[PDB]
């Protein structure tokens, strides 16, 4: 009980130390080809597990095409945790990232 509180404090301290604040973030404002691929795949996976959809799927049966529609209207509720070689990260939302 006492040894866990210290372990949790260290875990959350290291997390905060690695997190790059919204202002200090310096990566590409563009969503990488890889980011788009995973977002569309993961959101499709969520859609197939009866997750609340934020778009009107006009006769759409493919979850990926639904995930594609949600991306077009920037309604995908996901965040990209961009890691750097030291372990530090930049949290970028799907909404704010520029898509070609």
């Amino acid at each position: 009980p006492e040894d866990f509180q210290q372990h949790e404090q260290i875990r959350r301290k290291t997390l905060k130390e690695k997190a790059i604040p919204k202002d200090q973030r310096a990566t590409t404002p563009y969503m990488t080809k890889y980011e788009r691929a995973r977002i569309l795949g993961t959101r499709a996976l969520q859609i197939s597990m009866n997750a609340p959809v934020f778009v009107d799927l006009e006769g759409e049966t493919d979850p990926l095409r639904i995930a594609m529609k949600e991306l077009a209207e920037k309604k995908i509720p996901l965040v990209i945790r961009r890691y750097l070689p030291d372990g530090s990260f930049e949290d970028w939302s799907v909404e704010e990232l520029i898509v070609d």
Binding site: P85, D86, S88
Partner: protein, 215 residues
């Protein structure tokens, strides 16, 4: 009439050129006039009437430039020594080691002729914080940093290194390496930990800045 002497006068002058270029490249006050000294001016100032060069006369003192102290404040005076004896002994080397310590010199370049005694070579890292660097005059005939394939290597300050390790979130060793005994590393007189900035011409991007850590 000159059998082989004429060739040796030019080879020694060319080695003296490279040493002056090296001393200037490190950040010591050496004028462009002294570097661009012709063979005829060398013969009149450093060679006798008989036509023989006196290497003990070639030795000189170098002080850091105003620009070098504002980047490296712990950079001290430098002493260059051209040994007139073809084979450097344990007794001749001992006199040079004491010469640095007494005059409060921070760095000492020793240009030897043919070879150095294995016993004398042990006296080189025997007097810290003062550093001793040995160079063969035959290897100094041509400057390696003047070669088209050797880019501009610039030694970075403890602050410049600190900044580079921050921008890329790097650890000293996590960087590309340059050996402590690498020809250019020996030229600039690199110590372990010192980061060198390499401006290399690419046939894709043109001028490109890369870096290497001396270990």
């Amino acid at each position: 009439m000159d059998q082989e002497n004429e060739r040796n006068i030019s080879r020694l002058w060319r080695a003296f050129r490279t040493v002056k270029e090296m001393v200037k490249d490190r950040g010591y006050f050496i004028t462009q006039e002294e570097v661009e000294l012709p063979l005829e001016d060398f013969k009149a100032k450093y060679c006798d009437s008989m036509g023989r060069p006196q290497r003990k006369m070639m030795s000189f003192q170098a002080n850091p430039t105003e620009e070098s102290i504002s980047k490296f404040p712990d950079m001290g005076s430098l002493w260059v020594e051209f040994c007139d004896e073809p084979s450097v002994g344990v007794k001749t080397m001992k006199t040079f080691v004491i010469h640095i310590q007494e005059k409060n010199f921070q760095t000492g370049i020793f240009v030897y002729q043919n070879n150095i005694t294995p016993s004398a070579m042990k006296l080189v890292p025997s007097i810290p914080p003062a550093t001793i660097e040995t160079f063969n005059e035959a290897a100094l005939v041509v400057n390696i940093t003047h070669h088209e394939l050797v880019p501009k290597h610039i030694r970075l300050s403890s602050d410049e290194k600190r900044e580079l390790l921050k921008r890329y979130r790097l650890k000293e060793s996590q960087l590309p390496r340059i050996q402590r005994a690498d020809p250019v590393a020996l030229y600039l007189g690199l110590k372990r930990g010192e980061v060198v900035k390499i401006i290399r011409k690419s046939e894709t991007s043109g001028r490109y800045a890369s870096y290497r850590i001396c270990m």
